[PDB]
Write a protein that binds this ligand. Structure first.
Ligand SMILES: CCCCCCCCO[C@@H]1O[C@H](CO)[C@@H](O)[C@H](O)[C@H]1O
Ligand SMILES: [Mg+2]
Length: 535
């Protein structure tokens, strides 16, 4: 139902779709290929629905954070721009469109929060969060306020909270580790305490939301607000004389706002992928193509360097790019929905006093990572938690020859499935620091254990441990601030030593798994179906 020989494009109604249409006219003129621009209501839900029946637009425009979910569902084609083209766009914008090493869409525009200030009230705005209470007192005297912004949404509070070392999920080469959540930390504790202090100290109010902050700033009641480019036109109207600037630092750390990247993906079901590429690369992403769109509805900052250089002559757009460059690309994966909920309740609870700061952050740090996964992830989480409660770390510390063994560690488990799907193999990386006292070393090694399904009694089936054996060449000693003798030595002992203090525990932990997990896993091993992922 998608027609080969034309392009249908979906973009949101708040974007410059008429300008985009003009880009499409130019395209038809050159190629004779017709381009149709639509802005369906809720396209971000519509696209997965129709595209999963093999229908929908050839190209979809949307914030990058949805595209990770679309890629997982097989809805997006991999894009193949050459390196010279990639040099045309800012590198970090390419990271926003990465999924599993692959490029999954063309970056278009860049947006992040900025500090927006009233030049009549505040000709020289503060560079630090810390200055704000002082300003508020002064301004309270004149019947005004220092700072009002939406506290109801963690999107707005995150720049402060994550300022020092904080993150949503950890990024590795266009892969996010959904087990690794950076919510809780000294920065986040300090950052969030400060925010709560401001409410206790009367500088801000906990009930403040988007509409209250916007009115307050747009009526000239408050000197500063925190908002994005979408907010600008309402201020243009308000006759408030305003600047847009770098967010305040907290403890000398830049605020770290989330970055959205408007992006254009290509439908996996499109018969038109090559034309789509041609349109996006040689027509839309050009000084002329972006200008057309921008003149209709302004794009804010853009991913195209040449055009961004022009737009950045507007200090508001330059400030946007600068805040982006100091900010955190929003993870493009669906687990962000747990993250938003965890952080949203935490900040609201701390602000209301329903929880303390450390408590809200501690729950949120756990809750954001709590999204359930398929069999393989479940198994590996299960065994990790098992070994840890089963006291594996303690066992590590207790191995002898001075020495003092320290910093015992379980590392990310590996999982491999038989090509015939009937067999599982787990890798269990382990580590300790050695101290010769002086002379600190890092010892690491793997255990490989086979996981098996077997019938007994004689009908009933069970999940059983195969051979648990120290992986032969896996032992690695690393110097810290004399091998290979030590290694030579250790290889004669550790391997047999570890397996025999460990394999038994591994075997115990296996049995302590949730029973439905066990049954489910057994079932797919029996029938040789692959639940395990190539990495
Ligand atoms: C208002 C719409 C402007 C968007 C078009 C931007 C530039 C397109 O320019 C086109 O590039 C093609 C190859 O790269 C050439 O084949 C065409 O001759 C040229 O017209
Ligand atoms: Mg860059």
């Amino acid at each position: 139902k998608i027609e080969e020989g034309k392009l249908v494009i979906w973009i949101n109604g708040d974007k410059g779709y008429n300008g985009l249409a003009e880009v499409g006219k130019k395209f038809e003129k050159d190629t004779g290929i017709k381009v149709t621009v639509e802005h369906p209501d809720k396209l971000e839900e519509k696209f997965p629905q129709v595209a999963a029946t093999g229908d929908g637009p050839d190209i979809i425009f949307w914030a990058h954070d949805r595209f990770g979910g679309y890629a997982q569902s097989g809805l997006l084609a991999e894009i193949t721009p050459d390196k010279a083209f990639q040099d045309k766009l800012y590198p970090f914008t390419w990271d926003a469109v990465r999924y599993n090493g692959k490029l999954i869409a063309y970056p278009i525009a860049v947006e992040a929060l900025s500090l927006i200030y009233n030049k009549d009230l505040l000709p020289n705005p503060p560079k630090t969060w810390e200055e704000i209470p002082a300003l508020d007192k002064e301004l309270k005297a004149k019947g005004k306020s220092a700072l009002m912004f939406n506290l109801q949404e963690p999107y707005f509070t995150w720049p402060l909270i994550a300022a020092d070392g904080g993150y949503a999920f950890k990024y590795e080469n266009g892969k996010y580790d959904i087990k690794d959540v950076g919510v809780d930390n000294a920065g986040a504790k300090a950052g969030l305490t400060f925010l709560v202090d401001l409410i206790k100290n009367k500088h801000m109010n906990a009930d403040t939301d988007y509409s209250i902050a916007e009115a307050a700033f747009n009526k000239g009641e408050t000197a500063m607000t925190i908002n994005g480019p979408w907010a600008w036109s309402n201020i243009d109207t308000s006759k408030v004389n305003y600047g847009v600037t770098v967010l305040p630092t907290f403890k000398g750390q830049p605020s770290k706002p989330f970055v959205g990247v408007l992006s254009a993906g290509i439908n996996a079901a499109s018969p038109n992928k090559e034309l789509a590429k041609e349109f996006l690369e040689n027509y839309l992403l050009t000084d002329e193509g972006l200008e057309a769109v921008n003149k209709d509805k302004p794009l804010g900052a853009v991913a195209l360097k040449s055009y961004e250089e022009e737009l950045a002559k507007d200090p508001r757009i330059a400030a946007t790019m600068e805040n982006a460059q100091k900010g955190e690309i929003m993870p493009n994966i669906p687990q962000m929905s747990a993250f938003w909920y965890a952080v949203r309740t935490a900040v609201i609870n701390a602000a209301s006093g329903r929880q303390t700061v450390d408590e809200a952050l501690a729950a949120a740090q756990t809750n954001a990572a709590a999204s359930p996964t398929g069999l393989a992830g479940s198994l590996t989480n299960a065994l990790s938690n098992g070994l840890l409660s089963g006291g594996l770390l303690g066992i590590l510390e207790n191995l002898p020859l001075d020495i003092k063994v320290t910093d015992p560690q379980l590392l990310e488990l590996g999982l491999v499935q038989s090509p015939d799907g009937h067999r599982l193999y787990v890798t269990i990386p382990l580590g300790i620091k050695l101290q010769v006292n002086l002379l600190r070393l890092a010892v690491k090694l793997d255990i490989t254990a086979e996981i098996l399904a077997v019938r007994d009694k004689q009908e009933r089936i069970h999940l059983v441990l195969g051979d648990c054996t120290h992986s032969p060449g896996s032992l690695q000693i690393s110097l810290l601030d004399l091998l290979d003798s030590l290694t030579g030595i250790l290889n004669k002992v550790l391997p047999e030593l570890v397996q025999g203090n460990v394999c038994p525990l591994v075997n115990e932990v296996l049995r302590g798994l949730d029973i439905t997990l066990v049954h489910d896993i057994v079932n797919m091993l029996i029938h040789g179906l692959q639940f395990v992922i190539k990495v």
